[PDB]
Write a structure and sequence with these properties.
about 400 residues, Aminopeptidase, eight-stranded mixed β-sheet, seven-stranded mixed β-sheet, 13 helices, transferase, peptidoglycan synthesis, cell wall biogenesis/degradation
Length: about 400
Amino acid sequence: MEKMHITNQEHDAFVKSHPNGDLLQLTKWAETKKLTGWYARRIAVGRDGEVQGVAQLLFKKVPKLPYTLCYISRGFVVDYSNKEALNALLDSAKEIAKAEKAYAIKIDPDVEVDKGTDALQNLKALGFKHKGFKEGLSKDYIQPRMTMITPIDKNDDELLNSFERRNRSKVRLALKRGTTVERSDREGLKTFAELMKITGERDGFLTRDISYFENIYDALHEDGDAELFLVKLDPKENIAKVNQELNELHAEIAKWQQKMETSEKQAKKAQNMINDAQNKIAKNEDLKRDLEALEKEHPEGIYLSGALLMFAGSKSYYLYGASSNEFRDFLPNHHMQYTMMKYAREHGATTYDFGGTDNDPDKDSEHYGLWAFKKVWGTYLSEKIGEFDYILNQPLYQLIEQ
């Protein structure tokens, strides 16, 4: 068929609407990789003025050696059953990659094994070598080969119903206990980085600094493809809520007092309900005091958790999350997750991807916590076909790919 020149926006549109599109094939994602030494090139193929496949190629020089790697991260973006388009994309990639002294062309498209028979067959026939069906988070390939995904093309009740039972209960508590979820801005990243520092120290992880998050956010946020969410506990707002509850409780008492005075038969019940409401009033007043104490410490509230949410068309991604060691009983992360899923659905996404996992690892393994966390959120395990290399220089490939 034919090689085509399409604009950045045209490429991104095609990626966003293709079933095999992905965040890692967007032009603004390539912008984020400049900081770590990657440079980009694009290819497109089609017929009769209609694009049938695209790919964004990232190149990076191999330390100490006169070669590059060509990495098509989550490409090619093509129907892997379209042999003509697939071959044409390989033809174009080989031209560019040889000119860049690449030792191989590495691809890792988001195609589930379930649906990957054609892909495996057709890639094999074209000369690609497979890295194998190893653990979901094997160090033998760059991306996770398994992820955990929540279907979000659901109403609020259906979405909540999809979570595991204990977690549903925690989400309902989170919605009630008194935090708010904010869609933040670039200035919010300073709060986020602080939370991430705390999270790194609590878990065992090395944490990246604010500049690292700014690099991702600034490329994609303009297009609505990156958003930052922050969860706040605001004492003033909650004090207002308590004042309203106190007014409502006094009005309940008024109503039962009026039944007591007019209805002999209901008097014992009325006094009972009055006693209950009086107890609630006393407790609410105690809470008001505690919230006032908090307000003195944190006049404009305190942020408890935060996360970055990315998009590529109908795919949304929970990329990074962080939370502090304080006020954990408000369940801020649970409030955050459900809010972000709803936001993602409203933006046009139908899946919400929590990222990588092993498939049901044992408790002693380094990745167990990821499985324990992600499995309760109405997720299914997405097992991908994996990583494939079209090798251009055999001796170099053997040396490097260790």
